[PDB]
Amino acid sequence: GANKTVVVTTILESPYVMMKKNHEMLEGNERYEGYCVDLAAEIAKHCGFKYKLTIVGDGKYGARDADTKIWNGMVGELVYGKADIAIAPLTITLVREEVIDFSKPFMSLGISIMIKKGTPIESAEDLSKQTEIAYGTLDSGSTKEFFRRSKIAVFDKMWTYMRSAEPSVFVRTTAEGVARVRKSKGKYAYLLESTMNEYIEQRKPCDTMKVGGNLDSKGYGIATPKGSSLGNAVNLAVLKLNEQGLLDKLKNKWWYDKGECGS
Amino acid sequence: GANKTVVVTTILESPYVMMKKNHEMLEGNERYEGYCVDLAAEIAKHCGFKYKLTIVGDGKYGARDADTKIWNGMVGELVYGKADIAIAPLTITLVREEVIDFSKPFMSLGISIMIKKGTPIESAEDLSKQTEIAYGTLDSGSTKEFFRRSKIAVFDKMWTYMRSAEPSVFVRTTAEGVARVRKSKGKYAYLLESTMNEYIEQRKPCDTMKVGGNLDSKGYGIATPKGSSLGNAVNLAVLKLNEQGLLDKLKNKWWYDKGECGSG
Ligand SMILES: CCn1nnc(O)c1C[C@H](N)C(=O)O
Ligand SMILES: CCn1nnc(O)c1C[C@H](N)C(=O)O
Ligand SMILES: [Cl-]
Ligand SMILES: [Cl-]
Ligand SMILES: [Cl-]
Ligand SMILES: [Li+]
Ligand SMILES: [Li+]
Ligand SMILES: [Li+]
C-alpha cells in the first residue's frame, strides 16, 4: 500500500535520545536530540522512509516475564506490533534474536563496572569477594540476564548476592544507577555497558570511573519485527554508515566533542 | 562428496586455521587446527551437521574482480555454489552482505598498523604525511576496499598513495605482508586487522608491533550462500556460543602467550 510513517520505538537515555532545550514548545521529532536521533535520520534517508520517534511507554529495554511469557519494553513494542522499528542502544542477545530481527551491530560494547572515584575495586572478582560495597544492574534487560544465566563462578556468586540483596540493588533507569553511585560515598558500584560508562565519565561532576576489563563482548542492533520487509534495507544502511565513518563521527560528537570533563 | 555433508570453505591464516605438525600423515578435517577449526566443530555440533573442511583454492578472502565482475576467494566459493558455509576471519562488509548471508559477528576487531620495531610511525596520520616508509594492504579483501572507498581525509590520502605506489604495496597473503615488514628494515609498514597484528607481536622473532588505535570497528561473521537454510541455525549458534563464554575461551586458547617475547 501507500507509504506510511514508520513508528520508531526508542528510549530516553542520554546521549542516545534526550529532550532538546526548548522541547516544551516543540512537537514531533523536533523534541529530541542525540546519537540515536541522528542515526534514525540517517537510516531513514538511506532507506527512503518517513518516521515518528516514540518513547517506549514503560521505559524499558525488554525482557520476557518468566511466568506470563509476555515481553516488555522496546522488544515488546515490536513483538506486539506497536512499533515498526527500534533505534536505541538495544543489545543483540539470543533470547531477543529468537523473537525479533536485528541488523548487524552499529556499536560494540561489553558489561563494565562503574565506581565512584577512589572506590577500592578493580574487577568483578573484587566485587564478588567483599560485602561492604553493594552493586547491581538495570532491570528488564540484557545485563541482568547475563548474571542470571552465567555458569562462571564469579558471576554466579555476584548474581546470588544481587538477587537477594536488601534494599534492592537493581535500578529502573541508567540515570538512577548513576545517582546511586554518585551519592553512595563509594559503597555502591553499578554494572552497565561500557560505552554508557564511558559517556558518564565525560559528564560533570566527573566523579565516576570505568574500572576493569569488559565482562563480555557484544553489540547493539537496529531491531524490527520478525520477518519485517524493512530489515534488509536497514541492515545495509548500518553497514554503509559504519564503512563511511559516520557511526564513529556520531560517537565522537556525543561523547567527546560535547564532553564536560576537559579535553 | 557425501550426502548431508556441509562443505566448509576456510583459509590458512594463523591461528585461525593451521596445518598440524605431521599433517602429511593425517587425513580430512584432522589435518587442521586453530580457532576456526574449533569454531567449526562447535557450530556443527549445535546445528547437527557433518562437515568437510576445505581450504579456499585461490587463497583469498574475496572481492569482486573489477574487470570480469566475478567474485574470488571464499566469497566466490559461496556465490558460485562450491561451498555451503565459510568459517574464517572473514569481515562483514556491505558489498559482501549484498551477495552472501552472514551471522552476527563472532569476533570484533579493526584495521591496524604493523611496523618493524623502532620505525618512526605512531598513527595513520603519520603514515599519510611522509613518503620514506611505504605501506600497503592485503589484496582482494575488506582492508583494501576500506581505503578505496573512504572519504576520511587521512585514509583518502593513504589510498591515493597506495593505489599508485611502485613497486606495488599490495600483498597476496598476510604472511607476505608480515615478511615484507620484517625484511624492509623499517621501510614497509603493513595495514592488517588488529587480532592478527597482536598475535604476531607476541611471537618470535619479536620484531614487529601494533601502533596507534584501530582505524575502524567491525566484525567477522560466518557466511552462507544467500538464502541458505543453514543461516538461521548458524546465527543462533554464534549467539549461544558467545553468551556461554566459549568464544572468549577460544580466543584465550589460540592467543595464549607462552612468553616467546620477554617475560610472558
Ligand atoms: C545504555 C544501555 N545499557 N547500558 N547498560 C545496560 O544494561 C543497558 C541496556 C541494554 N543495552 C539492553 O538492551 O538491555
Ligand atoms: C586475518 C584477516 N585479515 N587481516 N587483515 C585483513 O585485511 C584480513 C582479511 C579480511 N578479514 C577480509 O575479510 O578481507
Ligand atoms: Cl592511527
Ligand atoms: Cl575527515
Ligand atoms: Cl580462558
Ligand atoms: Li531475530
Ligand atoms: Li555436501
Ligand atoms: Li548478505
Curated annotation (Swiss-Prot), chain B:
The shown chain, on whole-protein numbering, covers: 413 to 797 of 883
Q: What is this protein called?
A: Glutamate receptor 2
Q: Where is this site: Crucial to convey clamshell closure to channel opening?
A: I121
Question: What is the tissue localization of expression for this protein?
Answer: Detected in forebrain. Detected in dendrites of neuronal cells. Expressed in the pyramidal cell layers of CA1 and CA3 and in the granule cell layer of the dentate gyrus.
One GO term of the biological process aspect: response to lithium ion
Post-translational modification Phosphoserine, affected residues: S150, S184
GO MF entries: AMPA glutamate receptor activity; amyloid-beta binding; cytoskeletal protein binding; extracellular ligand-gated monoatomic ion channel activity; extracellularly glutamate-gated ion channel activity; glutamate receptor binding; glutamate-gated calcium ion channel activity; glutamate-gated receptor activity
Site Interaction with the cone snail toxin Con-ikot-ikot: list residues. Answer: R64, R148, K240
Instruction: Tell me, in a sentence or two, what this protein's role is.
Output: Ionotropic glutamate receptor that functions as a ligand-gated cation channel, gated by L-glutamate and glutamatergic agonists such as alpha-amino-3-hydroxy-5-methyl-4-isoxazolepropionic acid (AMPA), quisqualic acid, and kainic acid. L-glutamate acts as an excitatory neurotransmitter at many synapses in the central nervous system and plays an important role in fast excitatory synaptic transmission.
